[PDB]
Amino acid sequence: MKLSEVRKQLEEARKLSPVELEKLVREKKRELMELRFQASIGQLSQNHKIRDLKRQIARLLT
């Protein structure tokens, strides 16, 4: 159901859409590395987080 919430407000992401979208995903990938890092030390990441993060990016990138 995560999908519903995210996608709708990305066409709501149309106050300055394209430009803003580029920016948005840019910050999103950061929230990604931070994780892959935390999931390299060991105790700081509980899976999914990383996954769901990528899968949002997947859609955001439309």
Binding site: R26, K29, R30, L32, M33, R36, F37, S40, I41
Partner: protein, 92 residues
Amino acid sequence: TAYDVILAPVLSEKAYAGFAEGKYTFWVHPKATKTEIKNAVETAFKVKVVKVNTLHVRGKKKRLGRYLGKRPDRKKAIVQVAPGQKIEALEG
């Protein structure tokens, strides 16, 4: 496609020796430039990086039973931070 080059911190005794100087080292992308590494990490940690180094890592081949295989290959890179500064996250 900016924060995407830096893959993860290379975690080893020897890597930790590099924290003593500005010589941080981590797992980078296969096809990545010492030029786009500096630019990348710099815009990834907002620290000016003087010297950059990449070397290549052939992944050892390990066998899980009668089935034989091959681990991915990697490209280790060690960076050099503007004399003085450091990376708070890697210092851990």
